[PDB]
């Protein structure tokens, strides 16, 4: 099945894409994110390893794009990297989620390009608070050094590291949020309001929190969001009231903060559980989602309701069928419109750009 779809994808790449690059990493990555700086041009990616042994690393890769893929640095990491995210105000600083439940902070510029063969991990900060590992990880883009994390322990932790010397120290969570009653799968700050953030969990809820509230056990809003676990959310960077959630129910839901009683839209086409959803960094109507069905779907909300001649609803702009295994993470390139990096369980990293005629 997979093998037949893939053969058909390969034949069609020149008509569906302006760019496709494929690279098989040594070990699969659970995480992917484009760093914001660009020096053809040179772009960089934060990646991690997931191994059957003890050779784990935080990884920075370089990618040459029209204006090859190489490992620039590996940094010893304690166990697999569940997720890694750079701090928007200083992208030398990367947070990572470890299986032990610690969240680690690295300044990658402080490390040798070849990792220490001893295998020792030497993080610049070790952030304590969780009793279990997890995935959700989010830096506040309006308040430097405030980091949210979501865990399988049912909690969200918040740290404020802005006054802490990055000299190897342990920092406890400033606040712990306890409103969910099951694994918290994802957490994200609002992109314009420094006090607001969302969380989603296996209790099927989206919660909206306000850090100004004295009550850490009850959010400002609690939304019955999906008919199964909610794995990811993303706030729209250009539309202050709009956000999206993705779920084991196979849908992405669209929400408005002004009235969360009613879902705005349900984007339906995935055939299996969704793990990631991200808004386009360039276009306010554009989002993407990926997961267990090995597909990455790109949606355009300006097309909801449009007359068609179907293969899918009109808001489905593009299905990326290049991966042949579950997609673990993906990232929109913030410097070259429509370029995405996606990574899958079978070690494949793809860097691709759909054909201009599709969105044009």
């Amino acid at each position: 099945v997979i093998n037949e779809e893939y053969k058909i994808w390969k034949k069609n790449t020149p008509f569906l894409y302006d760019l496709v690059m494929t690279h098989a990493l040594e070990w699969p990555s659970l995480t992917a994110q484009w760093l914001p700086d660009v020096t053809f041009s040179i772009h960089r990616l934060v990646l991690g390893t997931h191994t059957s042994d003890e050779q784990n690393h935080l990884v920075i890769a370089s990618v040459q794009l029209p204006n090859k893929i190489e490992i620039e640095i590996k940094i010893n990491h304690e166990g697999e990297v569940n997720r890694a995210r750079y701090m928007p105000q200083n992208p030398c600083i990367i947070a990572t989620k470890t299986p032990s439940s610690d969240v680690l902070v690295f300044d990658y510029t402080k490390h040798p390009s070849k990792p220490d063969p001893s295998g020792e991990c030497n993080p610049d900060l070790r952030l304590r608070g969780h009793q279990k590992e997890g995935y959700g990880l989010s830096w506040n883009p309006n308040l430097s050094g405030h980091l949210l994390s979501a865990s399988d322990d049912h909690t969200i932790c918040l740290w404020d590291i802005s006054a802490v010397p990055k000299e190897g120290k342990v920092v406890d969570a400033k606040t712990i949020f306890t409103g969910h009653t099951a694994v918290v799968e994802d957490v994200s700050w609002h992109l314009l309001h420094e006090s607001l953030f969302g969380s989603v969990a296996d209790d099927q809820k989206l919660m909206i929190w306000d850090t100004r509230s004295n009550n850490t056990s009850k959010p400002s809003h609690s939304v019955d969001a999906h008919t199964a676990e909610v794995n990811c959310l993303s706030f729209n960077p250009y539309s202050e009231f709009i956000l999206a959630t993705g779920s084991a129910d196979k849908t992405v839901a669209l929400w408005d903060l002004r009235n969360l009683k009613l879902k705005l839209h349900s984007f339906e086409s995935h055939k299996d559980e969704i793990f990631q959803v991200q808004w386009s960094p360039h276009n306010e109507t554009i989002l993407a989602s990926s997961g267990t069905d090995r597909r990455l779907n790109v949606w355009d909300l300006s097309k909801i309701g449009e007359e068609q001649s179907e293969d899918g609803p009109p808001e489905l702009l593009f299905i990326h069928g290049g991966h042949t295994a579950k997609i673990s993470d993906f990232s929109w390139n913030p410097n070259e419109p429509w370029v995405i990096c996606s990574v899958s369980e079978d070690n494949i990293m793809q860097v691709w750009q759909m054909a201009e005629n599709i969105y044009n």
Binding site: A24, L25, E26, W27, P28, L30, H50, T51, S52, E80, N82, E133, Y135, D152, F275, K326, S328, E345, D346, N347
Partner: peptide, 13 residues
């Protein structure tokens, strides 16, 4: 034990 990661990742050397 977490359902979100496969239990047996494979190396490509």
């Amino acid at each position: 034990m977490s359902r979100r990661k496969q239990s047996n990742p494979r190396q490509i050397k």
